[PDB]
């Protein structure tokens, strides 16, 4: 029917054929995970005024060490109204501006009080131990951020600090790439909803919840199309609904002779284009990837296998990277890390992928990757952390032994 595709080729094909979505304007507070479609320029200096590093005293560095009059305190959030003449200081706290006349700051701990008024006990006089080089313990204007400079560049994938940066420079509206809306369905006449009691020959639909949760983890919005009957009429309806509401349509299950109603509907009815229908991998050989160009917009379509392990594995190898590209990330490829194999395993001729748990043991450089294999059985208090990427069988590698360095793909925030 469809040629066996190399795992390398399937993955490359998925990224090339996956489009980058366009952009939209959002409020900074919604920037989490968004990629900036613009440079962001700072319109003020930070700090805007010279600011003390320490809690202490603003001094003249020509005066050197000695006894000084305290004229006042520099209040937080005010422009200082006094000015410092020789033989004078002003008390400062850490956020505070430096008054004109001072060129340096000295900590409280490098001083000792001489006099206090004791009519309300304000300080009058300070002995200033120490000599301070000019500039000492001051953030001059524009120390951290210089006016007009590019604080964040186009292509930047934002996290909490980046949002803080937007907040800092006053840029509360920003143009970012869109997030893919992702629609998910399950196909199969054997499937019942999770809420239903089992009936003869039937099982509960688990993939729909697993996939929606997976895509949710990355924070893209999703659409639940539910269970769909394995037949042209019912498929064409759900796909059309998925297509009008979403950028990505994902389906799990369905059969693949002439009962491949899905591949048949994609080709005949929707005139989609199917780039591959089988891939030389384990699990997930029966995976299908297609694109459909509608009104210039390109929607993308994945048909993953019914097997629950295949569904989650394929979702992570193919779907997430594609979604990452749609959202505007410059390298959407996953992080692959070296780890040490916890348990012996025979190799398949197909490259194989095992859900595994990553643990960094104290003072050991590499993490240990413990394969789950397996639907249940292997019980860890901890969610599967990565995909163990086993190589294909060769004559020099019939099996792999505990301790050997292997590639693990990181899946999900630890």
């Amino acid at each position: 029917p469809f040629p066996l595709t190399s795992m390398d080729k399937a993955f490359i094909t998925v990224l090339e054929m996956t489009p980058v979505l366009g952009t939209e304007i959002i409020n900074y507070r919604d920037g989490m995970g968004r990629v900036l479609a613009q440079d962001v320029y700072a319109k003020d200096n930070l700090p805007p005024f010279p600011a003390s590093v320490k809690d202490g005293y603003a001094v003249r560095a020509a005066d050197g060490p000695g006894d000084r009059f305290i004229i006042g305190e520099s209040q937080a959030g005010e422009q200082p109204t006094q000015t410092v003449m020789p033989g004078q200081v002003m008390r400062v706290t850490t956020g505070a501006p430096i008054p004109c006349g001072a060129d340096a700051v000295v900590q409280v701990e490098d001083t000792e009080l001489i006099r206090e008024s004791d009519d309300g006990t304000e300080e009058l006089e300070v002995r200033i131990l120490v000599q301070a080089r000019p500039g000492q313990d001051i953030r001059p204007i524009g120390h951290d951020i210089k006016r007009g400079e590019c604080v964040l560049a186009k292509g930047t994938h934002m996290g909490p600090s980046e949002i803080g940066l937007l907040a800092t420079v006053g840029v509360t509206e920003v143009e970012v790439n869109k997030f893919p809306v992702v629609a998910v369905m399950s196909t199969g006449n054997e499937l019942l909803n999770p809420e239903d009691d089992l009936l003869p020959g039937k099982i509960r639909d688990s993939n729909r919840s697993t996939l929606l949760a997976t895509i949710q983890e990355h924070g893209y919005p999703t659409i639940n199309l539910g269970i769909v009957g394995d037949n042209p009429d019912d498929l064409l309806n759900a796909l059309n609904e998925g297509i009008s509401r979403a950028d990505v349509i994902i389906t799990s299950g369905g059969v693949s002779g002439e009962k491949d109603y899905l591949k048949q509907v994609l080709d005949i009815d929707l005139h989609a284009q199917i780039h591959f229908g089988r891939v030389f991998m384990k699990p997930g050989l029966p995976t299908t990837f297609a694109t459909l160009d509608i009104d210039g917009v390109r929607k993308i379509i994945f048909a993953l296998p019914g097997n629950p392990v295949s569904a989650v594995v394929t979702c992570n190898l193919f779907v997430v990277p594609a979604l990452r590209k749609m959202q505007g990330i410059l390298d959407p490829r996953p992080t692959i890390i070296k780890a040490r194999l916890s348990c012996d395993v025979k190799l398949d001729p197909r490259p194989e992928y095992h859900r595994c748990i990553l643990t960094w043991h104290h003072q050991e450089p590499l993490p240990w990757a413990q394969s789950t294999g397996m639907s249940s059985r292997l019980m860890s208090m901890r969610s599967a952390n990565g995909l163990l990427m086993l190589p294909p069988k060769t004559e020099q590698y019939v099996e792999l032994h505990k301790g050997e360095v292997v590639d693990v793909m990181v899946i999900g925030r630890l």
């Binding site: 190898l317 692959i336 163990l388 990427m389 190589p391 292997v406 590639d407």
Partner: peptide, 11 residues
């Protein structure tokens, strides 16, 4: 970057 996983001997 390699989507299929590897090993390589060190003897």
């Amino acid at each position: 970057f390699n989507i299929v996983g590897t090993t390589y001997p060190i003897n």
